[PDB]
Amino acid sequence: MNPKSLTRGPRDKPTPLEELLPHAIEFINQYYGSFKEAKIEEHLARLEAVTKEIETTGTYQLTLDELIFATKMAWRNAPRCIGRIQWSNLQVFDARNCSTAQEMFQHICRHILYATNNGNIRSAITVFPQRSDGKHDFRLWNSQLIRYAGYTIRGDAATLEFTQLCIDLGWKPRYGRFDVLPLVLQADGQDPEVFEIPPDLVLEVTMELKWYALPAVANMLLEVGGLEFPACPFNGWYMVAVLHSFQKQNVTIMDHHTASESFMKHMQNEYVLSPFYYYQIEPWKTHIWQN
Amino acid sequence: MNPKSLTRGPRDKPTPLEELLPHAIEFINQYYGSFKEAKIEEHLARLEAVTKEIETTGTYQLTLDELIFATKMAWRNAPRCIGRIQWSNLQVFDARNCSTAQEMFQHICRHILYATNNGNIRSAITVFPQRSDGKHDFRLWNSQLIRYAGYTIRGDAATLEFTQLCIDLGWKPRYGRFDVLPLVLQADGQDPEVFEIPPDLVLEVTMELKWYALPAVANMLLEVGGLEFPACPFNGWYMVAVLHSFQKQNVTIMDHHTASESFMKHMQNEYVLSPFYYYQIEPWKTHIWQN
Ligand code: HEM
Ligand code: HEM
Ligand SMILES: c1cn(-c2ccc(Oc3nccc(Oc4ccc5c(c4)OCO5)n3)cc2)cn1
Ligand SMILES: c1cn(-c2ccc(Oc3nccc(Oc4ccc5c(c4)OCO5)n3)cc2)cn1
């Protein structure tokens, strides 16, 4: 067998042009190929413009239309995602001009607000700046946007390490079993900063014990045309008393009705794999602290 | 850290009385507190009248005097606004009895006319109806009242998405690089309607290439005493050859003379932050089309 690695690690220098160029061209091809017989001259013009941009700047920038296409195709290319059957139902937030952790925080608040939608969950992805030389990475250190702290264990067991990490960074822990972890945000390669999520932004389902309604993956990397975006949180909705509690509180889960309706909406939008979502190495294992 | 979200999203039901009430009371307090030792009996009477109005109607209405105060304090509370140093220089237009998109259009024409003032720019805000149940929102889909369309890019790059949106809505594009976008106006929660701004209302500075003289933010939400106003466009004036072109054409910018004179005028008027201007989620990402 020759499976590929599902992890894409850090770099300490820009991607070499001889490597980036062919990848960029292959992506531009799959983008314009999605127009069948249309836009041959547009395809060539874009090829020419990207090549000169790479040769002059060392990299290139996607158009927002190309970015939206990439995020949806990477979702389609996700092997284990049940949700990928309706891949066209995705809202993209473009945060590629983001510069600070405080700005990252506001983008994430926007995402949580929109996606939670008072329970009527919507799928969304927020895309922060692509990797340049790999020393200025944007990253979310969280594994999910919303998750409970873990501390005889109290809270979520799978967060024990991250919870201690937040505490080390100055986060003041309560010791409940449903404490929502803070956001730990790294911008432009700097040391992470800690941001409490405003409680009103966290919708929870009461089991009739409780659980948060928004499942959002915070820690993966989007690869597209040789470009890498190491910060790109996305969310879908969840797939017992839980089955009853979510429906009774009007929070979306993937029951048969939702499966049918979301596929129907997808279907109306018609009126090595790449692009791809990669796992990364946990950033606290690779980060060089500056202070 | 525990920063607050700078975005305030949609609702699908009225604000609960147990939430609105304390907010209303706190605002009434800051309003009457602006009178120091004066009007204690007036303060109590207003508290009593607002409470009964909330308990009987589910909401309450600001007096125009309270509204003027709120708009000026929210401006004072705007962290990044250089202009907030002279917050008392603000003309308020009360459009809270507005019902249709056509009426919205006429209010906006009035605003542009008054604020442009043939180049001698005046700061103004126009306040449309507050949010009720959140299904009848007034919104301007534009980010600014005046902005050029973007389409190899032709025009403003940051409007490409909105420009395509107008085109989708039946707007017939020229393909110049200084096409003024139409107003896209939603009234009472209905689908937006498209209105060309009368060309004579748009003052432009010629660079001695050109640019519009009136910078007006169209898309923010004013919060005051628990009430939300999701349509409340405001304008100030602008902060190279541009510096020369504006002064030569007698269009106000914030040069030292204007800084001094506007502060002087402000100074003569003496002879979680709330109220506050929030960002919103772009309405085309949240709107449910009715037809
Ligand atoms: C509409 C809701 C969605 C549902 C019901 C859904 C469901 C799932 C499920 C059940 C898993 C496996 C979880 C596990 O094994 O622990 C998964 C994995 C994943 N999902 Fe989703 N998903 C949805 C939306 C999304 C979106 C919006 C994206 C990205 C734009 C996405 C990308 C992924 C990725 C990258 C993985 C890992 C795939 C792999 O390793 O093969 N999903 N999803
Ligand atoms: C007299 C002219 C004024 C000047 C020179 C001025 C200037 C500015 C500037 C330079 C910014 C930052 C723009 C950016 O970073 O992109 C700003 C932001 C803003 N301005 Fe003004 N402004 C003026 C009048 C007003 C008025 C009339 C209001 C409202 C009544 C206002 C409310 C705001 C708000 C809400 C923001 C964003 C504040 C933030 O995010 O912290 N401004 N203004
Ligand atoms: C969209 C979101 N995901 C996630 C996958 C995995 C996640 O981690 C996680 N932690 C605790 C509990 C769960 O439970 C699920 C199960 C199924 C599912 C989930 C979370 O989100 C999408 O579908 N997941 C969170 C989100 C996958 N696609
Ligand atoms: C009053 C008006 N504003 C605006 C802020 C931002 C706006 O968006 C925008 N778009 C393109 C170019 C600019 O340039 C500026 C720069 C400074 C400034 C501007 C616009 O308006 C007030 O002060 N702004 C428009 C208006 C802020 N206060």
From Swiss-Prot, chains A, B:
L-arginine binds at Q144, W237, Y238. It is found in: Cytoplasm, Cytosol. Induction: By treatment with endotoxins or cytokines. Induced by lipopolysaccharides (LPS) in macrophages (in vitro). Expression in the liver oscillates in a circadian manner with peak levels occurring during the late night. Macrophages. GO terms for cellular component: cortical cytoskeleton; cytoplasm; cytosol; perinuclear region of cytoplasm; peroxisome. It comes from the Eukaryota. Keywords: Calmodulin-binding, Cytoplasm, FAD, Flavoprotein, FMN, Heme, Iron, Metal-binding, NADP, Oxidoreductase, Phosphoprotein, Ubl conjugation, Zinc. Belongs to the NOS family. Homodimer. Interacts with NHERF1. Interacts with GAPDH. Interacts with S100A8 and S100A9 to form the iNOS-S100A8/9 transnitrosylase complex. Interacts with SPSB1, SPSB2 and SPSB4. Interacts with ELOC and CUL5 in the presence of SPSB1 or SPSB2 or SPSB4. Forms a complex with ASL, ASS1 and HSP90AA1; the complex regulates cell-autonomous L-arginine synthesis and citrulline recycling while channeling extracellular L-arginine to nitric oxide synthesis pathway. Produces nitric oxide (NO) which is a messenger molecule with diverse functions throughout the body. In macrophages, NO mediates tumoricidal and bactericidal actions. Also has nitrosylase activity and mediates cysteine S-nitrosylation of cytoplasmic target proteins such PTGS2/COX2. As component of the iNOS-S100A8/9 transnitrosylase complex involved in the selective inflammatory stimulus-dependent S-nitrosylation of GAPDH implicated in regulation of the GAIT complex activity and probably multiple targets including ANXA5, EZR, MSN and VIM. This is Nitric oxide synthase, inducible. The lineage of its organism: Eukaryota, Metazoa, Chordata, Craniata, Vertebrata.
